[PDB]
Amino acid sequence: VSTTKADLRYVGATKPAAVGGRRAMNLMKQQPFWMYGPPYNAVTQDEYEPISAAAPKAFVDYQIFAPGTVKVSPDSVNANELNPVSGMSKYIGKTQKLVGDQGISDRSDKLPM
Amino acid sequence: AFSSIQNVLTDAPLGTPSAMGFLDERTEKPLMGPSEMDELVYAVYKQVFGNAHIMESERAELRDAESLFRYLRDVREFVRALAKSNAYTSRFLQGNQQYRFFELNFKHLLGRGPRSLEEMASHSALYAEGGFEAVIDAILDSDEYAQEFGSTVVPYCRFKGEYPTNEEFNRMLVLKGANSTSDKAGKGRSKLCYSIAAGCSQNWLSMSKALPFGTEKGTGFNLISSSRNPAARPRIGTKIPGGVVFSS
Amino acid sequence: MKTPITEAIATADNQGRFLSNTELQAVNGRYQRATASLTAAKALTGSAQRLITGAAQAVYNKFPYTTQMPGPAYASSAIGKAKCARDIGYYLRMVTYCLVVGGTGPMDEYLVAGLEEINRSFDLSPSWYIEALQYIKNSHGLSGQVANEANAYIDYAINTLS
Amino acid sequence: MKSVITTVVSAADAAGRFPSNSDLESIQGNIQRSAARLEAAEKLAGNHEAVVKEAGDACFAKYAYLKNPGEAGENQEKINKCYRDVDHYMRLVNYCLVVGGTGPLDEWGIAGAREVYRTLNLPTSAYVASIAYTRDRLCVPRDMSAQAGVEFSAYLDYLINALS
Amino acid sequence: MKSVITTVVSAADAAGRFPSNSDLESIQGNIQRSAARLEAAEKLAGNHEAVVKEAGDACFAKYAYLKNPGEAGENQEKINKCYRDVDHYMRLVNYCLVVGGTGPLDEWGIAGAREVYRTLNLPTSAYVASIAYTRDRLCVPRDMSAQAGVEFSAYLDYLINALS
Amino acid sequence: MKSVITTVVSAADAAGRFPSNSDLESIQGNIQRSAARLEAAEKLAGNHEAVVKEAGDACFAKYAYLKNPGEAGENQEKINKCYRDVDHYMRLVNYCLVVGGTGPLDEWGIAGAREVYRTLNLPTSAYVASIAYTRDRLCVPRDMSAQAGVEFSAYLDYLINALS
Amino acid sequence: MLDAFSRVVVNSDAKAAYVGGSDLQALKSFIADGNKRLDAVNSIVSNASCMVSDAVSGMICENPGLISPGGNCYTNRRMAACLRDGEIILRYVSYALLAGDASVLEDRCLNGLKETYIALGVPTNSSIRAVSIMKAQAVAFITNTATERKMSFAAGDCTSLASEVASYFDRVGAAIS
Amino acid sequence: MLDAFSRVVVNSDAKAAYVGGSDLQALKSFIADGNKRLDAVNSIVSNASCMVSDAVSGMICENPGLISPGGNCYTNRRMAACLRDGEIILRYVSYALLAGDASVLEDRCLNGLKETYIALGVPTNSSIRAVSIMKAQAVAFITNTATERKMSFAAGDCTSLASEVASYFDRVGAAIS
Ligand SMILES: *C(=C)C1=C(C)[C@@H](Cc2[nH]c(/C=C3N=C(/C=C4\NC(=O)[C@H](C)[C@H]4CC)C(C)=C\3CCC(=O)O)c(CCC(=O)O)c2C)NC1=O
Ligand SMILES: *C(=C)C1=C(C)[C@@H](Cc2[nH]c(/C=C3N=C(/C=C4\NC(=O)[C@H](C)[C@H]4CC)C(C)=C\3CCC(=O)O)c(CCC(=O)O)c2C)NC1=O
Ligand SMILES: *[C@@H](C)[C@H]1/C(=C/C2=NC(=C\c3[nH]c(C[C@H]4NC(=O)C(C=C)=C4C)c(C)c3CCC(=O)O)/C(CCC(=O)O)=C2C)NC(=O)[C@@H]1C
Ligand SMILES: *[C@H](C)[C@H]1/C(=C/C2=NC(=C\c3[nH]c(C[C@H]4NC(=O)C(C=C)=C4C)c(C)c3CCC(=O)O)/C(CCC(=O)O)=C2C)NC(=O)[C@@H]1C
Ligand SMILES: *[C@H](C)[C@H]1/C(=C/C2=NC(=C\c3[nH]c(C[C@H]4NC(=O)C(C=C)=C4C)c(C)c3CCC(=O)O)/C(CCC(=O)O)=C2C)NC(=O)[C@@H]1C
Ligand SMILES: C=CC1=C(C)[C@@H](Cc2[nH]c(/C=C3N=C(/C=C4\NC(=O)[C@H](C)[C@H]4CC)C(C)=C\3CCC(=O)O)c(CCC(=O)O)c2C)NC1=O
Ligand SMILES: C=CC1=C(C)[C@@H](Cc2[nH]c(/C=C3N=C(/C=C4\NC(=O)[C@H](C)[C@H]4CC)C(C)=C\3CCC(=O)O)c(CCC(=O)O)c2C)NC1=O
Ligand SMILES: C=CC1=C(C)[C@@H](Cc2[nH]c(/C=C3N=C(/C=C4\NC(=O)[C@H](C)[C@H]4CC)C(C)=C\3CCC(=O)O)c(CCC(=O)O)c2C)NC1=O
Ligand SMILES: C=CC1=C(C)[C@@H](Cc2[nH]c(/C=C3N=C(/C=C4\NC(=O)[C@H](C)[C@H]4CC)C(C)=C\3CCC(=O)O)c(CCC(=O)O)c2C)NC1=O
Ligand SMILES: C=CC1=C(C)[C@@H](Cc2[nH]c(/C=C3N=C(/C=C4\NC(=O)[C@H](C)[C@H]4CC)C(C)=C\3CCC(=O)O)c(CCC(=O)O)c2C)NC1=O
Ligand SMILES: C=CC1=C(C)[C@@H](Cc2[nH]c(/C=C3N=C(/C=C4\NC(=O)[C@H](C)[C@H]4CC)C(C)=C\3CCC(=O)O)c(CCC(=O)O)c2C)NC1=O
Ligand SMILES: C=CC1=C(C)[C@@H](Cc2[nH]c(/C=C3N=C(/C=C4\NC(=O)[C@H](C)[C@H]4CC)C(C)=C\3CCC(=O)O)c(CCC(=O)O)c2C)NC1=O
Ligand SMILES: C=CC1=C(C)[C@@H](Cc2[nH]c(/C=C3N=C(/C=C4\NC(=O)[C@H](C)[C@H]4CC)C(C)=C\3CCC(=O)O)c(CCC(=O)O)c2C)NC1=O
Ligand SMILES: CCC1=C(C)/C(=C/C2=NC(=C\c3[nH]c(/C=C4\NC(=O)[C@H](C)[C@H]4CC)c(C)c3CCC(=O)O)/C(CCC(=O)O)=C2C)NC1=O
């Protein structure tokens, strides 16, 4: 009883890595949010792609621009939503990794190269 | 030096307004008026004697030290007059062990704890060479007394934050109890007798009993014992890409 | 496990005989060779995280395409760099084990047995690890027989990779 | 697994007799109540990470002393395993909503739990307080249907009475 | 806790005397003015997600450089941290408006703020800009009665002074 | 009661045989170690209200959350029964120091305690923390002799390992 | 230390919750009887010396062993020492009644008092009796029920304050037990 | 307190033995790398503030419960003190590295620290994490392995000094455990 979405994604993992490129990691699935924490440390798919290793030397001044162009927004304005009494926070720290989704990415649509 | 609990979890210290009037062209200091001087003396009695419940038959002998104090505002000479009285010696020198008297002086006149065995030895030598009054004169005319309290404030147990050694903090909390804790619970038998000469530390519960309000006192105690083992040689590794190294 | 001790025992047990003077001399050679190998193990232990970081940087400088090409086998992302540093640390740990043990016993058991299977399936080129081991041989900063003993276990791994 | 089918085939096997009319009569009620308990289980399955997050902070809000040193919730490794164990209990409750009985609870979460929680210094009152908070935040028409809420709170009370 | 009651009873404790009528007179002073000073209690309580909204963005607009690389606001969740860190000050001015004195603020937000704001390189000018924004964003006729606005501003500029 | 005499007469009664030399040999060691354990028990008997007071506040110092409402230490009736139960445990330890074995502990304090403390919502970690505090405040020369301290701490560790 | 307003503030800080309008009925009602509490505290402190002098004498009344040689209250020193304590405990319960919170009672007076009395050999039961006599005449004065000592008040019920001060004396009684 | 030269002197005094030529290889080799130790200590003390501010922030990074209300590092006061604790540890390990002996650490630091933290309710595991972050960047600076912060040195190996300072941080870590 498979689906079209699943089969299309899984078929990219049948090609050799030297050909498949990023798609060679397409057989991995989302896992319960606590599997990504300290003891288990399951890896997400965004950690196998060059997007997680981008640390360029150049930077944007963020001062050259005339006042009124830079925009800032938070995720919320609340003490115990940004960080609960416990350490389980989605916005501060290293616990923003412990989320149910976000375990895989749909960035394998770009190309096989 | 931040005193994370000196002036926010604890009141401000008490004493004379300021030392500029001591320069004295027409008066020695602004007449704090007799009603803000009786509370100063009440504060001093609660400190140098440390809640000794002194009756007025026994406060009829401290009349002369008081009568000079309200006339000439130096606080340090007031406590120098108090600690040499029979009211001080009969309570702290008469029934007690030696290092008990020595350690009580650190609580009363310096507001801290003895940091080492050598300090106690130096006090012992200084007592043996001719009197106990020399002990009190060394403490009162000390440098440490000048750069902590001076001639203006009552000597109080200050939380320094930046202690010269940590055991000084532990032993400050053990001598200072809670309120409604006095200094004739044990009949002599100083609390730091063993721990000074040995070098170990004190009970966690009795230190936590003397902490101020709202300081999450006592918590965080693992259920196995508290004193560490000097002879332990644990292995703890770091994290390397290839493996773990026990850089010890 | 290939030590000078266990091979002497294996040669005595193959005849089913007691330990002759042949085996005792083979063990004595280990004992007056061990003093420099234990110094080499101490020195390679002390310089470990510096050497691993330098070896990874030397591999990235020699082969810059490994930091650029997308794919799981390359160190283009962060987990790839972490696994590359983990592999270089594995190689250095096997070299130190062979130094303290006194032969190519640990790394024969742990590294080269079934090694090219992994490089063929995971598609990781052995020339990268050769380039890392050449940096470690050139940059450990040892002298005398300490250097002669550490280098001799380094190029054994190089010879098996080639 | 303790369920409707297994109880009656185990009783008929202990007696050594064929399935009679009372056994089949017991399965008609399974057919009846599966319309409520399955759509309770599905609604629990579709929104479980919100409930596990919501009930996890009630434990540390009620017992803030667990984050002190010396306790069982010091660093992030303990809090992550706390959320993991709460998610385990919610998954077992989802399983018991499906099987129709308390089998998966009684064998995968309850049996042996007391020795573990006493040995590993885990206070059972805070493993209880999350389940207690989950029960009280259940309104009758909003979260599920009326009988689904009864079916859900019954297994929650079973877990609470087992750990207390 | 610097309050009107804690001043007088601590004074009586230091003097070792019973509470006299000079002491009771101050609590009478509280009796009058709580009504005005707690009227702003709702106004801060129910409207607080909006004031931090307008305050943090004003802070970041007045000093645009702070988002540059190497500054405090270089990524996202540091900006969220900033907004939290002003939320804390709003929560403390509400507490102080309730107790009657500057008790909560000078021991929970002010005490030791110095080192924290220097060693983590956080410019205090940015904090005072956001606070002074809300100090004059207030309107006397629309926002409160007349006297709540006085005392709210008197608490705000308290910390606007200490931070300076 | 589990002791030295009772174990060997129970073994000889199970075997159905007279007391042999090994049985009497086991009583010579009771004669030996009674010189230490009895003067441990006497020193515990003479100063017990100081120790029960001293170990009672360590429980609430470590766990200050018990005095909150909804917990097991709300009013004075709970704290008085807490001190009473700690005194009960110290009395049973005094009894085991006298009888020579863990009989009075195993039957009057330990057997059945887990069902009571789970049912009545009594956290066992705080019934343990007082016994743990009592063990660490012992100096053999200062409090008792050297072997008396060993004999005392052995029964304290037995009670701790039984409740944990 | 804390008071009634600083109670709710720290309770809400544990939740990181603002003090909203729902929590202010307790405090606004606390302000309603503000004049009642002030009318009660001077009534109590107005008879402070007589209450203590009556309390220790009542202690002695049914325990004549305290006067006897070897009694804890034998000589004039010990009467003087004991006499202080009746007034000192009274001062702290008056502070607690004034603040509306016993946070300045079990942190400035009762902390470590049981051990101090144990070391000094002070009998607990007689001290508890002294505290209870003081308790009963505290309620007598708050409710204007004293046989003599007619004090002018405003008409109403002060029973809640009576219960409050009784609860404060309760924790003194239980602290040294 | 003691140093490397005063180590061997007290060791030989326990034997009543003169310090002869056999025992002076250790010290004369200690003098050989004397310039190395001086080249290491200013490298460490030259980054003292950045190391501490990085260390406590790293502590907080994987333990966000310390910021939370009721956290030990909740308010600005407690950050300030916790900031102070890092400098006290770092200064004492620098002293020990300079003297070549840890005889100054556990008498004027670790000695009576675990109990102070237990009474204050300071979490041990997070503090151990803070100490280990400081440890790792101590070795990073000694070996000139820091990603930035290029410091000019003389060529050679400072690995032994790196292991020395790692051993000093080890005993801080084990003292409060
Ligand atoms: C010994 C057998 C014995 C005593 C000594 C004496 C002490 C005592 N008194 C009471 C009852 C009261 N004490 C009161 C106090 C005062 N009355 C005043 O007019 C002034 C202001 C003040 C001090 C002199 C009052 C008013 C009473 C009546 C009861 C009340 O509370 O109002 C007791 C009983 C204690 C009690 O339960 O209240 C004792 C022991 N009485 C003796 O029997
Ligand atoms: C939270 C998730 C988190 C942080 C906050 C941050 C803190 C942190 N940093 C390191 C690693 C280093 N720290 C260094 C220190 C400095 N670099 C400088 O240029 C100045 C002089 C100084 C202070 C600003 C350096 C050089 C490093 C690189 C590693 C090294 O030691 O050289 C860590 C890891 C701790 C460790 O194991 O070293 C942490 C936690 N990083 C975060 O992840
Ligand atoms: C009048 C003297 C001012 C002025 C006031 C206006 N404020 C407006 C909106 C607004 N104001 C605030 C801050 C204020 N509201 C509060 O609830 C509190 C504290 C409890 C304060 C200090 C906020 C947060 C907002 C946005 C939400 C809202 O609209 O209420 C407003 C409407 C238009 C506008 O945005 O300005 C007015 C007129 N405005 C003035 O021009 C003078 C200086
Ligand atoms: C011990 C390692 C230290 C030391 C500790 C101190 N103990 C002090 C008082 C004290 N301790 C106990 C517990 C212990 N003593 C007993 O008699 C019994 C049981 C029979 C036990 C478990 C008690 C009951 C007391 C109070 C009575 C007393 O004075 O002994 C103490 C005084 C200060 C304090 O109250 O803690 C210290 C310093 N003393 C030492 O000499 C070694 C080094
Ligand atoms: C920060 C990384 C820690 C942490 C630190 C806190 N320490 C607090 C008080 C405090 N710390 C010490 C030890 C320190 N003082 C010294 O003299 C020496 C060595 C010579 C050291 C290491 C002492 C003695 C004290 C008390 C001194 C006093 O204030 O009287 C503290 C205050 C909390 C509060 O009560 O508000 C904090 C936060 N806490 C942490 O969670 C991390 C692990
Ligand atoms: C060791 C010897 C010795 C003394 C003799 C006294 C001397 C003396 N008297 C007073 C202080 C005083 N002395 C007097 C005494 C008198 N006023 C008169 O008009 C009468 C002539 C006389 C009583 C017979 C008064 C009335 C005051 C205080 C006046 C005031 O300031 O209100 C003070 C100030 C002390 C103080 O309060 O700080 C001193 C030192 N004290 C001593 O230590
Ligand atoms: C009031 C009564 C009273 C005493 C009895 C002494 C007891 C005493 N002796 C020493 C301290 C000492 N006491 C001795 C004595 C001896 N060592 C021996 O092997 C012999 C048995 C004995 C000499 C006959 C020594 C040798 C030291 C110091 C040892 C050292 O630490 O170097 C100290 C520590 C004081 C200090 O230095 O700080 C004290 C309190 N002091 C007093 O106040
Ligand atoms: C399939 C069924 C199933 C379960 C129901 C759970 C049951 C369970 N929970 C824990 C384990 C735990 N449970 C908690 C939770 C808490 N402790 C606290 O401080 C708070 C009171 C509370 C947070 C909610 C913690 C901290 C641990 C880890 C204990 C430890 O490792 O020290 C463990 C120990 C093994 C581990 O998780 O590492 C087990 C078996 N696991 C299962 O496999
Ligand atoms: C499948 C398991 C499941 C539960 C245990 C509950 C629990 C629950 N409640 C809410 C969320 C909510 N729950 C309520 C509560 C109520 N609203 C009303 O109309 C009633 C009067 C009252 C219940 C008595 C309110 C007002 C919210 C939104 C605000 C909040 O987050 O609490 C949420 C967040 C998602 C949502 O918006 O619903 C969840 C998971 N709901 C579930 O789906
Ligand atoms: C002869 C052997 C013997 C014992 C060992 C004790 C064991 C014991 N303790 C308690 C009972 C108790 N033990 C505690 C103690 C505590 N709860 C807390 O909040 C803290 C964790 C801790 C304080 C130290 C409390 C509060 C009760 C009373 C429980 C209740 O009535 O709700 C009870 C219930 C009956 C009662 O005491 O009212 C029993 C049987 N009793 C015995 O007869
Ligand atoms: C701020 C809080 C605070 C208190 C509450 C008291 C508590 C207290 N009481 C006494 C001291 C005393 N307390 C009493 C009083 C009594 N004993 C009895 O037999 C009676 C029951 C009772 C009288 C009603 C006695 C008799 C002494 C002196 C005992 C002695 O001679 O040692 C002492 C020490 C004695 C001294 O130093 O002289 C202290 C600290 N003091 C305080 O600082
Ligand atoms: C500065 C010192 C200071 C005080 C002493 C009080 C004085 C005081 N008490 C009350 C007022 C009152 N006092 C009482 C109390 C009582 N009425 C009775 O008949 C009972 C016997 C007794 C109970 C204790 C009552 C019932 C009121 C009126 C209700 C109220 O005002 O809340 C009032 C307001 C109305 C009035 O003037 O009477 C004032 C000013 N207030 C202060 O500011
Ligand atoms: C008063 C302050 C004071 C100092 C700071 C030092 C400065 C200093 N360092 C070295 C000298 C040195 N410093 C180093 C250290 C290193 N070389 C490296 O490449 C490594 C990165 C790093 C390891 C820590 C080495 C290897 C030498 C030469 C060996 C030696 O002199 O012992 C020398 C001697 C030779 C030279 O001038 O360079 C001096 C004066 N001495 C002082 O008196
Ligand atoms: C016993 C000793 C031991 C060795 C030798 C070893 C090698 C090893 N390296 C692997 C992967 C890897 N190795 C690398 C390393 C590199 N690739 C590059 O581009 C860099 C140039 C180079 C780092 C210097 C990378 C990036 C992977 C992940 C490849 C993948 O998952 O497809 C894997 C696949 C399993 C895994 O995902 O971890 C093995 C078994 N494992 C061992 O246990």
mmCIF file with all atom_site columns, C-alpha atoms in Angstrom, chain B residues 94-160:
data_model
loop_
_atom_site.group_PDB
_atom_site.id
_atom_site.type_symbol
_atom_site.label_atom_id
_atom_site.label_alt_id
_atom_site.label_comp_id
_atom_site.label_asym_id
_atom_site.label_entity_id
_atom_site.label_seq_id
_atom_site.pdbx_PDB_ins_code
_atom_site.Cartn_x
_atom_site.Cartn_y
_atom_site.Cartn_z
_atom_site.occupancy
_atom_site.B_iso_or_equiv
_atom_site.pdbx_formal_charge
_atom_site.auth_seq_id
_atom_site.auth_comp_id
_atom_site.auth_asym_id
_atom_site.auth_atom_id
_atom_site.pdbx_PDB_model_num
ATOM 1  C CA . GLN B 1 94  ? 36.318 31.765 81.593 1.00 0.00 ? 94  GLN B CA 1
ATOM 2  C CA . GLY B 1 95  ? 34.775 28.482 80.774 1.00 0.00 ? 95  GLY B CA 1
ATOM 3  C CA . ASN B 1 96  ? 36.252 27.830 77.398 1.00 0.00 ? 96  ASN B CA 1
ATOM 4  C CA . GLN B 1 97  ? 38.999 26.129 75.467 1.00 0.00 ? 97  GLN B CA 1
ATOM 5  C CA . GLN B 1 98  ? 41.764 28.289 74.040 1.00 0.00 ? 98  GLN B CA 1
ATOM 6  C CA . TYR B 1 99  ? 41.101 28.112 70.316 1.00 0.00 ? 99  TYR B CA 1
ATOM 7  C CA . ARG B 1 100 ? 37.446 28.573 71.280 1.00 0.00 ? 100 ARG B CA 1
ATOM 8  C CA . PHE B 1 101 ? 38.250 32.049 72.604 1.00 0.00 ? 101 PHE B CA 1
ATOM 9  C CA . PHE B 1 102 ? 40.498 32.745 69.634 1.00 0.00 ? 102 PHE B CA 1
ATOM 10 C CA . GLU B 1 103 ? 37.859 31.694 67.121 1.00 0.00 ? 103 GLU B CA 1
ATOM 11 C CA . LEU B 1 104 ? 35.141 33.672 68.870 1.00 0.00 ? 104 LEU B CA 1
ATOM 12 C CA . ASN B 1 105 ? 37.249 36.780 68.424 1.00 0.00 ? 105 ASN B CA 1
ATOM 13 C CA . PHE B 1 106 ? 37.174 36.291 64.659 1.00 0.00 ? 106 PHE B CA 1
ATOM 14 C CA . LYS B 1 107 ? 33.391 36.100 64.796 1.00 0.00 ? 107 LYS B CA 1
ATOM 15 C CA . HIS B 1 108 ? 32.943 39.072 67.101 1.00 0.00 ? 108 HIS B CA 1
ATOM 16 C CA . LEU B 1 109 ? 35.492 41.670 66.072 1.00 0.00 ? 109 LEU B CA 1
ATOM 17 C CA . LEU B 1 110 ? 36.398 40.667 62.520 1.00 0.00 ? 110 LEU B CA 1
ATOM 18 C CA . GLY B 1 111 ? 33.255 39.016 61.182 1.00 0.00 ? 111 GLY B CA 1
ATOM 19 C CA . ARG B 1 112 ? 35.033 36.161 59.410 1.00 0.00 ? 112 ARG B CA 1
ATOM 20 C CA . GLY B 1 113 ? 36.627 32.810 60.087 1.00 0.00 ? 113 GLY B CA 1
ATOM 21 C CA . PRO B 1 114 ? 40.234 31.793 60.682 1.00 0.00 ? 114 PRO B CA 1
ATOM 22 C CA . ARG B 1 115 ? 41.710 30.823 57.348 1.00 0.00 ? 115 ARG B CA 1
ATOM 23 C CA . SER B 1 116 ? 44.484 28.476 58.461 1.00 0.00 ? 116 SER B CA 1
ATOM 24 C CA . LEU B 1 117 ? 46.399 26.776 61.246 1.00 0.00 ? 117 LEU B CA 1
ATOM 25 C CA . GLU B 1 118 ? 49.187 29.361 61.133 1.00 0.00 ? 118 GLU B CA 1
ATOM 26 C CA . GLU B 1 119 ? 46.843 32.208 62.013 1.00 0.00 ? 119 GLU B CA 1
ATOM 27 C CA . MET B 1 120 ? 45.820 30.290 65.114 1.00 0.00 ? 120 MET B CA 1
ATOM 28 C CA . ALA B 1 121 ? 49.448 29.589 65.940 1.00 0.00 ? 121 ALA B CA 1
ATOM 29 C CA . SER B 1 122 ? 50.307 33.265 65.605 1.00 0.00 ? 122 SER B CA 1
ATOM 30 C CA . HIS B 1 123 ? 47.467 34.187 67.941 1.00 0.00 ? 123 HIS B CA 1
ATOM 31 C CA . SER B 1 124 ? 48.623 31.514 70.381 1.00 0.00 ? 124 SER B CA 1
ATOM 32 C CA . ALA B 1 125 ? 52.181 32.835 70.436 1.00 0.00 ? 125 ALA B CA 1
ATOM 33 C CA . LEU B 1 126 ? 50.873 36.361 70.786 1.00 0.00 ? 126 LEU B CA 1
ATOM 34 C CA . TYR B 1 127 ? 48.741 35.370 73.770 1.00 0.00 ? 127 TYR B CA 1
ATOM 35 C CA . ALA B 1 128 ? 51.548 33.472 75.488 1.00 0.00 ? 128 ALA B CA 1
ATOM 36 C CA . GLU B 1 129 ? 53.925 36.434 75.388 1.00 0.00 ? 129 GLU B CA 1
ATOM 37 C CA . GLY B 1 130 ? 52.203 38.493 78.042 1.00 0.00 ? 130 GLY B CA 1
ATOM 38 C CA . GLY B 1 131 ? 48.444 38.665 77.864 1.00 0.00 ? 131 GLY B CA 1
ATOM 39 C CA . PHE B 1 132 ? 45.166 38.307 76.060 1.00 0.00 ? 132 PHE B CA 1
ATOM 40 C CA . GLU B 1 133 ? 44.834 42.068 75.737 1.00 0.00 ? 133 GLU B CA 1
ATOM 41 C CA . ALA B 1 134 ? 47.600 41.798 73.167 1.00 0.00 ? 134 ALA B CA 1
ATOM 42 C CA . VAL B 1 135 ? 45.362 39.482 71.148 1.00 0.00 ? 135 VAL B CA 1
ATOM 43 C CA . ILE B 1 136 ? 42.545 42.009 71.054 1.00 0.00 ? 136 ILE B CA 1
ATOM 44 C CA . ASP B 1 137 ? 44.939 44.868 70.283 1.00 0.00 ? 137 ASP B CA 1
ATOM 45 C CA . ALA B 1 138 ? 46.458 42.953 67.396 1.00 0.00 ? 138 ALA B CA 1
ATOM 46 C CA . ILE B 1 139 ? 43.039 42.186 65.957 1.00 0.00 ? 139 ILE B CA 1
ATOM 47 C CA . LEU B 1 140 ? 41.595 45.667 66.452 1.00 0.00 ? 140 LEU B CA 1
ATOM 48 C CA . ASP B 1 141 ? 44.636 47.613 65.251 1.00 0.00 ? 141 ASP B CA 1
ATOM 49 C CA . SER B 1 142 ? 45.065 45.200 62.369 1.00 0.00 ? 142 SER B CA 1
ATOM 50 C CA . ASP B 1 143 ? 45.242 46.093 58.729 1.00 0.00 ? 143 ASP B CA 1
ATOM 51 C CA . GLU B 1 144 ? 42.351 43.721 57.988 1.00 0.00 ? 144 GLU B CA 1
ATOM 52 C CA . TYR B 1 145 ? 40.199 45.663 60.433 1.00 0.00 ? 145 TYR B CA 1
ATOM 53 C CA . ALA B 1 146 ? 40.998 48.971 58.738 1.00 0.00 ? 146 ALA B CA 1
ATOM 54 C CA . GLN B 1 147 ? 40.218 47.772 55.255 1.00 0.00 ? 147 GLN B CA 1
ATOM 55 C CA . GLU B 1 148 ? 36.995 46.007 56.266 1.00 0.00 ? 148 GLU B CA 1
ATOM 56 C CA . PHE B 1 149 ? 35.126 48.100 58.852 1.00 0.00 ? 149 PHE B CA 1
ATOM 57 C CA . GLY B 1 150 ? 37.163 50.994 60.136 1.00 0.00 ? 150 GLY B CA 1
ATOM 58 C CA . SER B 1 151 ? 36.131 53.546 62.727 1.00 0.00 ? 151 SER B CA 1
ATOM 59 C CA . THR B 1 152 ? 32.590 53.973 61.472 1.00 0.00 ? 152 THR B CA 1
ATOM 60 C CA . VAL B 1 153 ? 30.618 50.727 61.292 1.00 0.00 ? 153 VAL B CA 1
ATOM 61 C CA . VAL B 1 154 ? 29.808 47.900 63.640 1.00 0.00 ? 154 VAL B CA 1
ATOM 62 C CA . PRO B 1 155 ? 31.914 44.897 62.679 1.00 0.00 ? 155 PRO B CA 1
ATOM 63 C CA . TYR B 1 156 ? 29.566 42.567 60.818 1.00 0.00 ? 156 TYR B CA 1
ATOM 64 C CA . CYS B 1 157 ? 29.785 39.252 58.988 1.00 0.00 ? 157 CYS B CA 1
ATOM 65 C CA . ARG B 1 158 ? 30.292 40.534 55.464 1.00 0.00 ? 158 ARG B CA 1
ATOM 66 C CA . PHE B 1 159 ? 29.771 38.233 52.501 1.00 0.00 ? 159 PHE B CA 1
ATOM 67 C CA . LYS B 1 160 ? 32.830 39.167 50.462 1.00 0.00 ? 160 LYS B CA 1
#
